[PDB]
DNA sequence: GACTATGCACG
DNA sequence: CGTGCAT
DNA sequence: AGTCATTCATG
DNA sequence: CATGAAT
């Protein structure tokens, strides 16, 4: 079950797709019901990449997806939405999810992705503190040493390990309302390069991946 | 071994232990601080561990856990379902708990899941704490007998009418509507003074709930015979605007927005009424329900029929049952606060009983101090001509018939303390201690005097903490 | 505003970010300690919150919640779940953590939800965090830089090879036996002296896998492939005994009881081998299983069958791989033994450094008292003589030239404390520590008294826990 | 899903009710399973006096024990064991699960019941240590047993059964040797109606009455 | 990262 | 049906 | 007082 | 199909 807006208008309305139900809470309520929607998924989705046919669409998150769209796997286009947007925690279960989810549209809805239709969302991790309040906002570790620096001595610091932990006001004047926000657009520059690299990571093989990790993965 | 039971004997004492402890343990808000048992435990908790309004807030998750392990022996979800209601304003009218994330909402949509959010006291609710740390209050063992708990909070407002409570236990169920903090207190302190108090008279003070989801309120009668009797029925109903559209921003408090606009536009699509023509606009910071209407602009005969077939109109019903003299009453407002005063009495007395001995102690010591000023020079030459610390201490009281505590005072004072001799300082703070000592025992045998005190921080607190009323009388 | 990413390169950082935080961070064992960082965090966590085997236990809810709040970000059951393995002597072959109630058992029936049990830390899991308080090993902030958490423990002893660990990431996956932590010590202390060590003589003292679960081993050959090379295949056969009758006494780790047993009754059904005849009679205090055998006893055929059929003889796989230098390694018995002990000269060097400054610092405060115990008088005429406690200080150190710190202790000195004038108690101690300072300035640029240091601690770490070998070798 | 005993003896054999998978455990655990089966039931258990036919028949706990005994709702007898004993964890919500057990089976079972097959298993909530041992039931045992221990000791609280261990278990409240049951029977019938329909029934306005009368607050 | 069943009173 | 503490 | 989906490597 | 940390 989804969270749909208001209009039904495929020109300007934006899916947002979250990571669970708590996420889908602070979602819905810091938005704009008139071209915005949320749909949770229930954590980690299937290897699209992994599985088969059957083992995928019969998968209840998949299939959600896939029925809330419209086009369909085949694909077709113009429903539903002209926006795609993959709204996950600000960690890094959350990066893990937005690789499963985009070899998801990347394996079948391709055009979707051609198109330049697929978003990837930038929320906050940490939030850093000093009537007078000085706030400022760190996406991973590194940023996190310069706010550190810049609020020295006082400064409160808060994490927020999944989405549901900030509240409303939050999500939406940092990550949702486009005046303010920033979004990622997914492209494919080759094929033949993202079959090439999807295939390895996201593959079934295993000894690929784990060359690809040694000689790439810094573990400074 | 076996003991031979009947089944009547048998299902009487397993019936009996249950509902008796569901009543008095469970369900049931005492009618001192209006609290049910997870509740208290939770403030307590959070209290000691001091997560405080004035403080960073902490993982709802750390709170949970440490409550579960020190005092409350159930479900984690219980007790965090609990703690997340006490963070909801449009539940409470004045919040015990400051929660950060999603602690859901009038749409319904549910709290987010405890290891998600961070939770923090209200700053009303270290009112109701205050003065918990000065013997003020009954305690008992936690059930480990590891640590001791309090059997009811101090209670600096009358949080029982204030946040009302519900409800459902073996024999008895329990519905109190909220009230405005403001208008409460100025019945409790009017009855202060004029205890034999009529209702008619305290309803000039309390006229009735104040709901935080705001609303109009009509009943006159019948909110009488609540406030009496302790059962009544209200009727409640949806503010309403007409644009040019009827427009809705309030709804009759613990009805569900969410459901409340799908079933309004079930009447449109089942065509039940004439010019039904439904959207729902709302975000972070006001209500807004839209009803624009179609051509026969029939919208008095539309807006009646949605009162009457929807729940834009309800009624509320009370049902104000506490737990006094650890047992079910049905009360009506004069019990709920004449024995919330009375509390208050107690309190107040025992608070400054611990403080008058704590006075006279330093008393005692000051009074020591002050002697010993003028003997240094041979005291200390006594205490270097002394073996142990513990002979120290023997020998003076020996000498200069010091007392025990007296001579441990002189003894452990270290030695830049005697950078500091001077009589004039300890006879400031002796003075200050006498008179503080015998303003005390008059409040203590002094009955008025005693009263009068409770009215002022009454009336401090109302100074503090009061807000206009958000719901409508008609 | 927008910024616009391709596939791969997005596709490229959000897999390395994930792939990278898994090795280090969740699944692989450090080298060092061998623990996963929750297991790191739940020993840490317990043991600052001092839940030690020598008190009572605590209620493991309240110490899931403070891992979650203080230092783990993620899921109870997850911590729980993983608190509750390091409680299964079945599972560990060192127990760290002791658990009172149902956590569990061979059968697989599940441990008892959290918010029944209670747990605390055994005794040799101190060892693994003994020193830690004296500045031994690196500490991070945790995730809220709020409190501060070690990147890894101590370790009295080589945790890694005693409670092998399993063991799976993005790319690496790890499988490691548990090892019997007499002689594991034995190849470390080996080691300590002949580094150059070859495997062929380590294996004398580490001649392969201890489990808990008893049972007989048999490849040599391959355990030393394993031991070089790091992966590696070897056998298991549970322990079997004829009763006049087949019976069953202890099984291949990590494999099911309860459905061992029913897999061979269906051997039986299926008439799938002939004299099929199985009952488990298993109590607390014993492993039974009975194949009790019927008519042509073809007995050795049956046995020999049921091995290779069922899960009654199996393979256990090495996959040593750990977290060295931050990155993966499969590593061998020799890797693991040596950066084991590389550690523990950190370990005890740093220690020592810490040790000796606390020295040094008490000693120039010893050093100053007995001067003072000469000047007692005058010293403290100037005290009295002084403003205040700060200008008390000034005063000293501009006259007698005292220092800093010396000033604040015979400040600060209580008056009893003059009760014992001296120097010669305070000369005893000054000994004591000169001795200390020097013993340790040794072990500090000394090499070899460093690791002899190292070889006893070790030696009275074997002594103490030592236990005889379950697990017999083929 | 039940845990059987090995032999099939409806002669001798015990049905051991419990309140959950958690206890389940530490009962499975200390057992003698020549003679003791156990089976878990997920909480409360449906008010058999308060809801139909069809709803109760429906609901999977109380099904699953109609089939693990045997006879069946009529009823019929010698299945399935000659003991079925209830144990619930040692607090006042184990207490209601008890009222609940024993309706169900008195409104059907009922010939087991009058039989004398119904049994009520009697285990600790507090255990106080000083090494010196004792077992408590309910806050009055406690007193004396703190009276007892004096100073140093330290009490333990069985908030659930899944919270001792296995020979605690035994030892205490299921072996026969050292153990001690309660054997429900009905000793009127009309007196048992009366009573069950009251506490048990659906119309509270009586129940609250028995409640005023009877509960001492004290 | 989520979900389901029960008691209890009352309209 | 839902409400709030519980199993 | 319970339960379910999903990732990841390996046999 | 577990296994053991995670969503
Ligand atoms: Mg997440
Ligand atoms: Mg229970």
Request: negative net charge; without cysteine; charged residues 35%.
């Given at each position: 079950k989804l969270t749909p807006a208001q209009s039904k208008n495929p020109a300007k309305n934006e899916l947002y797709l979250v990571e669970?139900?708590?996420?889908?809470?602070?979602?819905?309520?810091?938005?704009?019901?008139?071209?915005?929607?949320i749909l949770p998924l229930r954590g980690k989705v299937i290897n699209t990449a992994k599985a088969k046919m059957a083992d995928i669409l019969k998968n209840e998150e998949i299939n959600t997806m896939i029925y809330t769209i419209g086009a369909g796997v085949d694909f077709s286009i113009e429903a539903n939405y002209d926006k795609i947007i993959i709204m996950t925690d600000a960690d890094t279960d959350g990066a893990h999810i937005q690789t499963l989810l985009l070899t998801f549209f990347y394996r079948y809805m391709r055009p979707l992705v051609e198109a330049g239709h697929v978003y990837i969302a930038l929320p906050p991790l940490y939030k850093m503190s000093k009537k007078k309040e000085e706030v400022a906002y760190a996406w991973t570790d590194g940023e996190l040493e310069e706010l550190r620096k810049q609020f020295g001595k006082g400064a409160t610091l808060q994490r927020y390990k999944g989405l549901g932990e900030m509240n409303a006001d939050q999500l939406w004047e940092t990550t949702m309302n486009p005046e303010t926000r920033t979004l990622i657009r997914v492209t494919i520059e080759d094929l033949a390069r993202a079959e090439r690299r999807v295939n390895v990571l996201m593959g079934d093989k295993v000894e690929p991946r784990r060359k690809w990790i040694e000689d790439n993965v810094k573990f400074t | 071994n076996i003991q031979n039971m009947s089944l009547e004997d048998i299902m009487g004492e397993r019936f009996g232990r249950y509902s008796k402890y569901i009543i008095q343990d469970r369900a049931l808000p005492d009618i001192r601080d209006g609290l049910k048992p997870v509740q208290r435990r939770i403030l307590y908790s959070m209290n000691k561990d001091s997560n405080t309004f004035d403080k960073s807030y902490r993982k709802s998750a750390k709170s949970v856990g440490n409550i579960m392990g020190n005092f409350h022996p159930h479900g984690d979800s219980s007790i965090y379902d609990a703690m997340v209601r006490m963070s909801q304003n449009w539940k409470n009218r004045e919040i015990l708990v400051e929660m950060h994330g999603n602690n859901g909402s009038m749409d319904g949509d549910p709290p987010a899941a405890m290891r998600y959010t961070e939770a923090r006291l209200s700053e009303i609710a270290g009112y109701l704490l205050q003065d918990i740390e000065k013997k003020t209050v009954p305690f008992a063992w936690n059930f480990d007998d590891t640590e001791k708990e309090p059997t009811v909070l101090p209670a600096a407002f009358p949080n029982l009418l204030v946040n009302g409570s519900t409800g459902i236990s073996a024999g008895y169920a329990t519905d109190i509507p909220p009230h405005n903090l403001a208008e409460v207190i100025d019945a409790a302190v009017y009855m202060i003074d004029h205890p034999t108090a009529k209702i008619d008279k305290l309803m000039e003070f309390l006229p009735g709930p104040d709901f935080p989801t705001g609303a109009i309120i009509q009943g006159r009668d019948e909110i009488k015979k609540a406030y009496e009797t302790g059962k009544?029925?209200?009727?409640?109903?949806?503010?309403?605007?007409?644009?040019?559209?009827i427009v809705i921003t309030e709804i009759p408090y613990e009805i569900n927005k969410a459901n409340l606009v799908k079933k309004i536009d079930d009447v449109r699509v089942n065509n039940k009424v004439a010019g039904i023509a439904v959207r729902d606009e709302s975000d972070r910071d006001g209500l807004r329900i839209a009803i624009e209407l179609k051509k026969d602009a029939n919208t008095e005969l539309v807006l009646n029929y949605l009162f009457k077939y929807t729940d834009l109109q309800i009624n509320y019903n009370f049902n104000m049952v506490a737990i006094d003299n650890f047992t079910p009453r049905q009360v009506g407002i004069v019990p709920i606060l004449s024995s919330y005063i009375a509390h208050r009495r107690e309190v107040i007395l025992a608070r400054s009983r611990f403080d008058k001995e704590k006075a006279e102690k330093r008393l005692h010591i000051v009074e020591g101090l002050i002697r010993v000023i003028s003997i240094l020079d041979e005291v200390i030459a006594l205490i270097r001509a002394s073996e142990n610390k513990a002979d120290?201490?023997?020998?003076?009281?020996?000498?200069?018939?010091?007392?025990?505590?007296?001579?441990?005072?002189?003894?452990?004072?270290?030695?830049?303390?005697?950078?500091?001799?001077?009589?004039?300082?300890?006879?400031?703070?002796?003075?200050?201690?006498?008179?503080?000592?015998?303003?005390?025992?008059?409040?203590?045998?002094?009955?008025?005097?005693?009263?009068?005190?409770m009215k002022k921080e009454l009336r401090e607190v109302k100074k503090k903490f009061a807000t206009p009323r958000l719901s409508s009388l008609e």
């Open positions: 669970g139900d708590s996420a889908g809470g602070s979602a819905k309520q810091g938005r704009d019901r008139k071209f915005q929607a | 009544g029925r209200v009727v409640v109903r949806s503010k309403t605007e007409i644009e040019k559209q120290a201490k023997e020998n003076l009281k020996v000498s200069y018939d010091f007392t025990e505590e007296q001579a441990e005072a002189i003894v452990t004072l270290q030695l830049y303390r005697l950078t500091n001799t001077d009589v004039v300082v300890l006879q400031e703070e002796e003075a200050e201690l006498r008179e503080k000592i015998a303003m005390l025992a008059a409040i203590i045998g002094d009955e008025r005097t005693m009263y009068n005190l």
